Amino acid sequence: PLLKFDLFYGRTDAQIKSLLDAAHGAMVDAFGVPANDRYQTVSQHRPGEMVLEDTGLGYGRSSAVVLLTVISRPRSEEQKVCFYKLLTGALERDCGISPDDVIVALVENSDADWSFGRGRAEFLTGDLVG
Amino acid sequence: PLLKFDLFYGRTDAQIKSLLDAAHGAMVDAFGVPANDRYQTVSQHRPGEMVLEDTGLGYGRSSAVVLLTVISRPRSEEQKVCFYKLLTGALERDCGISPDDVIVALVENSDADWSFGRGRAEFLTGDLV
Amino acid sequence: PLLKFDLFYGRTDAQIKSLLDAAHGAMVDAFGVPANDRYQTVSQHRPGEMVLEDTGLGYGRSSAVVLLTVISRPRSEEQKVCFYKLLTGALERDCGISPDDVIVALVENSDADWSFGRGRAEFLTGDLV
């Protein structure tokens, strides 16, 4: 999958790397994909450029908040549930980010909807599985 | 849903917050979700960073152009059609943005594809909806 | 469709425009859409802000790496395969970007999920086919 993060400015480069490493690990373990299946962007925002409330659930938000949008081929409900739990556990333990500050939206596509390089559709050619 | 706006730089902070409030209102009006079901991001762009034409329709575009991308569980065609009209209505009235300067694309997902907090899938657990 | 690019900072305005023009052409060639069906954004990143490996495929990426996200109504598998090829071809010829530096992910939607202007759902009204 592709992991796109929206965060506020204020982290050091190492803290941003840490966040990305922690999240990548959670994804690999929840999804069972290769360790080098790593595709991640970070967009940093000024105050004002995100409004992230809680739908009345009683979260907890700060300027440390992390919004993650994932584009992925179909995963089981169990894999998605586990990814969410692994993600917040990693970001808490590794980065000191409260689980109240993590929000994830996932969108799905399929085999023909990826090219990782060279103009090839690797899920279609079978270079990747599949 | 999650509302992601791409706009050009130039608005003041209060003008940005107006676009966000106007759009959020429209969304609540069209979709009937809780008022605090508010998830929005804004990416501001230098000249050059968007090219947005009109497929020959005759719109009107300026530096005020707003591109909105929505991630949402399925809504009806009716709800979508109403959203678009509500959205440009509110942006015109509240923000002075011509409806010519508004573009929307929506993509859909499912109950399992959201986590609003704490690693929980609240549509799956039944905490929402 | 809508084409959203994530790239690293460092290109001149002309190089950004070259990259968009190139990508646009390849899209129009693959998909058979009007030349003015042009909707593109670019988000530029500091080093650190993208990590793009290769799943062991043996691709040699550089800082020129382009990540493209496409939102589109359904196209045939052939058209998608053709787009990826034409896109890399064009980015290499027109921009000097290695095909190893081009990544694409596509997400689909449908007729009711687009508003190009005026809060009109043009695929639904028939303004566009």
CATH number for the domain including B54? 3.30.429.10
Contact, C91 vs C102, CB < 8 A?
A: yes
The domain in which residue A98 lies consists of 1-130
Instruction: With H, G, I as helix, E, B as strand and everything else as coil, classify residue C35.
Output: coil
Hey, CA dihedral for B122, A6, A24, C99, is it positive or negative? positive
- Cβ contact (<8 Å) for A42 and C56? no
Alpha-carbon Rg for chain C in angstroms: 15
Contact, B118 vs A56, CB < 8 A?
A: no
Q: What b/e sequence results for A92-106 when a residue is b if at least 16 CB atoms lie within 10 Å of its CB, and e otherwise?
A: beebebbbbbbbbbb
Interface test with C, best of B43, B55, B80 (most C CBs within 10 A): B55
Query: Judging by beta carbons within 10 Å of its beta carbon (0-12, 13-18, 19+), is residue C125 exposed, middle or buried?
Result: exposed
- Cβ contact (<8 Å) for C41 and B55? no
- Give the number of domains in chain A: 1
Query: Could you give the count of Cα atoms lying within 13 Å of B73 in the half-sphere of its Cβ?
Result: 14
Task: For chain A, list the contacting chains (3+ Cβ pairs, <8 Å).
Answer: B, C
Q: How far C58 CA lies from chain B's nearest CA (Å)? A: 31
| Main-chain phi, psi angles of C110, to 5 degrees | -140, -175
> Which chain B residues have a beta carbon less than 8 Å from that of C44?
49
Hey, CA dihedral for A44, A49, A55, A59, is it positive or negative? positive
H or E stretch including C123?
Answer: helix C122-125
Task: Name the amino acid, one letter, at A118.
Answer: R
Residue A34 falls in the annotated catalytic set: no
Instruction: With H, G, I as helix, E, B as strand and everything else as coil, classify residue C58.
Output: coil
Between CA A120 and CA B127 the distance in angstroms is 42
Strand partners, C95: none
Hey, CA dihedral for B106, A7, A115, C101, is it positive or negative? positive
Tokens standing for residue B108 = 């859909």
Query: Judging by beta carbons within 10 Å of its beta carbon (0-12, 13-18, 19+), is residue B127 exposed, middle or buried?
Result: middle
Tokens standing for residue A56 = 């009345």
Contacts of C18 (CB under 8 A, 6+ apart): C94, C95
Measured CA distances, C101 to B89, C61, C105 (Å): 42, 5, 14
Interface size between A and C, measured as CB pairs under 8 A? 109
Q: Which of C36, C119, C122 sits opposite B53 (nearest CB)?
A: C36
> Which chain B residues have a beta carbon less than 8 Å from that of A53?
36-39
Cα-based angle A31, A8, C6 (whole degrees, multiple of 5):
60
Instruction: With H, G, I as helix, E, B as strand and everything else as coil, classify residue B100.
Output: helix
Three-state secondary structure of chain A: CEEEEEEECCCCHHHHHHHHHHHHHHHHHHHCCCCCCCEEEEEEECCCCEEECCCCCCCCCCCCCEEEEEEECCCCHHHHHHHHHHHHHHHHHHHCCCHHHEEEEEEECCHHHEECECCECHHHHCCCCC
- Cβ contact (<8 Å) for B119 and A102? yes
H or E stretch including B40?
Answer: strand B39-45
Short-list C74, C103, C77, CA closest to C88: C103
